[PDB]
Amino acid sequence: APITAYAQQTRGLLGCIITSLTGRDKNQVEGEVQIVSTATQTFLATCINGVCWTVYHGAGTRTIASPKGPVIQMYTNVDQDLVGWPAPQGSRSLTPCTCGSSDLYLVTRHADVIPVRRRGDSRGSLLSPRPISYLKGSSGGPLLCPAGHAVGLFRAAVCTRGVAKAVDFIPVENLETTMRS
Amino acid sequence: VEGEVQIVSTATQTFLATCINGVCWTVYHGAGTRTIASPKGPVIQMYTNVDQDLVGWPAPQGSRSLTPCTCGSSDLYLVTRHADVIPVRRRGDSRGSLLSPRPISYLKGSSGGPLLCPAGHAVGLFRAAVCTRGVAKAVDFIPVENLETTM
């Protein structure tokens, strides 16, 4: 089984805003990765082991809109640059990688999966560099090992002249450390 | 919803075609030099490579292109006309062995289908099954490079 992915927009600009203010989202949830937004920006949130994780630089300290009103974050780690809320009812969680593979695949907000070679604990190089505009909105998305397990979450692009050659990510290890603190 | 793989057929038989980089590719031994049908009439092939057993027409409607592989993995996955996925171990430039041999009937009608890498990117097109006594243990395939070069 190869890694394939698809995206589906579930909500528009004006409905997003109202939902942001009310904090009550009645839409049905499906999937492992949620496309997420604030009046400021849009990025991704990945469900791993019952917890919906994302970048602190994106969600800040905000609540996530749910069918029962706003939901406070379960974990927040300004230093690890992570925040996590209970995974929405309906979503599916990924499980952390255990195979220790160094060949990773980043899933972008456009549901494209691009190969990245692990060059360290929090870095990996794009086998095929793409312009940063392409990676825009993918912060918080998952870096999967060949078996489809969470190795890390996309955090920042390593670019020059507007082209990203590597990616900086939050290894799944920092998640456990964050839940422990 | 758009598909990367088209299940196509001539008067003689059925097989598959895969859209890679804006072109709908398939096996010359299945399509020959035929045109592909469209609501505005028959459209001719853009590429005909009898030697590499490759033909290509402009991608049809309701299709979406597949990205060519660039991670060089050897863990391939053949997709059949029934949407079955078969893990294949790449043995060479254009050969691979099924991880679990299957009856030839199982791979019947899938030529032209894609051989995908762990990222779902096109590694090549399924050319022919290599069988022994009606059991497919391996497959022949046209590497994406051939396609990329033909263009």
Binding site: T4 | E2, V5, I7, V8, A11, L16, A37, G62, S63
Partner: peptide, 16 residues
């Protein structure tokens, strides 16, 4: 005789 498309496969399983 043209080659005719008789069906389509979506690799991601995208419904609808």
């Amino acid at each position: 005789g043209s080659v005719v498309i008789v069906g389509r496969i979506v690799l991601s399983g995208k419904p609808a």
